Amino acid sequence: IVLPPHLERIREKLAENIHELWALTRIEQGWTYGPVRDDNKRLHPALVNFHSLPEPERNYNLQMSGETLKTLLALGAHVGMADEKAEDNLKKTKLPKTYMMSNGYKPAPLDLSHVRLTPAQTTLVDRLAENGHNVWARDRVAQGWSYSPARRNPRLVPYRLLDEATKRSNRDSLAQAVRTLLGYGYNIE
C-alpha cells in the first residue's frame, strides 16, 4: 500500500530530522567528516547537510522514512495534521562549535523536548519496534525497514536478534521518528 499523497511532505521532513539525529549521535562518538569511510579514524562521508548527500543515499533515507509512515498506517494508526501552527514554532537544537565538521556541517536536530507521547502513541512505537520488518542496518548504524545461495542481506539484522542495547537504540530511533511527526503538528491515534 503506497504512501498517501498528503504524507509526502512530512516524509521529507522526517528523513531530514532523522539524519540530523543520526549525525549528532555519530559526532558525539568521535566521528568526523571524510570523503571515504574509515572506521578506525571514525571518518564518515555522510556527515554533511542532508541535501548534500549523494542522491542514492538521500533516496534510501526517504524510502526508510516513508516505510516508518507506511508501517504506522499498516498498524492502523490515523495520521493527520492537527496543529497547523506547530511547524512555524519549532526550534532547532543549537550545538557548540565542537560539533561542527571540517566542511562546515553542524547537526541541528529539532528540539522536541516539549513533545510527550500519549499512551496509544507509546504503544505504536513499541509495535513499530516489534514489527517483523524492523531491522538494524548495522553498517549504517541506523534503524530501518526491510520490505521486498543468499537472497537476504544479513547486515539488515531483525530486531528480534539484536542484543538489548541495540534493541534500545532501534526503539529510541522510532520514538524520535514518531515525536518528530508530533512536533510538526500531526496527531497520531
Residue numbers in the entry: 861 to 1008, 1014 to 1054
Study text:
Ryanodine receptors (RyRs) form ∼2.2 MDa calcium release channels located in the membrane of the sarcoplasmic and endoplasmic reticulum. Triggered by either cytosolic or luminal Ca2+, or by conformational changes in the skeletal muscle dihydropyridine receptor, these proteins govern several Ca2+-dependent processes, including the contraction of skeletal and cardiac muscle. RyRs contain three different SPRY domains, named after ‘SPlA kinase and Ryanodine Receptor' where they were first discovered. RyRs bind many accessory proteins and small molecules that affect their gating properties allosterically.
The SPRY1 and SPRY2 domains are separated in sequence by tandem repeats, encoded by RyR1 residues 862-1054 (‘Repeats12'). We solved the crystal structure of RyR1 Repeat12 at 1.5 Å resolution, which shows that its two halves are not symmetrical. Each repeat consists of two α helices, and short single β-strands at each C terminus assemble to form a two-stranded β-sheet. However, Repeat2 also contains an extra three-stranded β-sheet which breaks the symmetry. This sheet is formed at the expense of its first α helix (α1'), which is considerably shorter than the corresponding helix in Repeat1 (α1). The β-sheet fills up the space between Repeat1 and Repeat2 and mediates extra interactions, including a salt bridge between Arg1,000 and Glu917. The two Repeats are separated by an unusual 30-residue loop that is completely structured. However, the RyR1 R1043C mutation (R1044C in rabbit RyR1) affects a residue that is involved in multiple hydrogen bonds, including main chain atoms from the U-lid.
